[PDB]
Design a protein around this nucleic acid. Structure first.
Length: 204
RNA sequence: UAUAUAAUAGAAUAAGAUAAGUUUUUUUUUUUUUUUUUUUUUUUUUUUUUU
């Protein structure tokens, strides 16, 4: 109902952490609660922060990827940049990155870019995984990836970008996105020949 | 097995009439002219005294 009554939800979110019930909860329930709290633009951020801190190391060690992406998306849309939880997410993503679907990779890239996460090697490995499945990407994933804030830094290597560049021209059809990607190409480390050739078809 | 992301800049320079909001001696000095009073000098007239 998009019912904004945050002074009521604050009581429930205080109870969740007062009774130490934030640790035994199932991961999927957490990934749904936080995503819902990121839908009405919750205000009392400190309570959500204390809720995030409670969950221990054991829980993050073996969470499935599908609730993990929901949790990171809820953190990003809530504009949270907790330091010691991003390292947990980063090292946990090492073992399950192959299992991510193309939509999940597209979501994760921009969700991490929007929270100021600066561990370059994990974003590079995510970009490599995305380029591996380049033929398997649809329009929505292209919008979520190429429309990310500051994607120019993630266009670093030649072999990690070209594999998806074509698909981008072939599939997406909104002219605004075409001009956005054409403008973003100019601020990377790609060579001039490749940039010129890509913009020869991209702009339109 | 998902319904959705959005940020780039430049300049140095002036006109000009609206029927409006106090008042608190008047006096001192210098020069010229006229009138009145006092003093001094000269001339004329009258009276008294002396030679």
């Amino acid at each position: 109902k998009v019912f904004k009554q945050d002074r009521i939800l604050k009581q429930c979110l205080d109870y969740l952490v007062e009774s130490n019930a934030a640790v035994k909860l199932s991961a999927t329930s957490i990934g749904a609660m936080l995503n819902s709290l990121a839908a009405i633009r919750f205000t009392y951020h400190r309570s959500v922060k204390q809720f995030m801190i409670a969950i221990s190391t054991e829980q993050w060690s073996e969470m499935d990827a599908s609730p993990l992406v929901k949790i990171v998306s809820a953190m990003a849309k809530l504009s949270l940049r907790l330091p010691q939880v991003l390292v947990h997410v980063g090292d946990r993503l090492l073992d399950v990155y192959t299992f991510l679907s193309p939509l999940d990779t597209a979501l994760v890239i921009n969700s991490l870019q929007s929270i100021g996460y600066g561990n370059d090697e994990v974003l590079m490995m995510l970009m490599r995984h995305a380029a591996s499945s380049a033929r398997r990407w649809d329009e929505v994933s292209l919008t979520l990836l190429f429309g990310a804030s500051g994607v120019h830094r993630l266009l670093r290597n030649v072999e990690v970008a070209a594999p998806l560049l074509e698909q981008a021209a072939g599939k997406t059809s909104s002219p605004h996105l075409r001009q956005r990607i054409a403008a973003s190409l100019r601020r990377s480390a790609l060579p001039r020949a490749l940039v010129q050739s890509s913009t020869s078809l991209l702009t339109g």
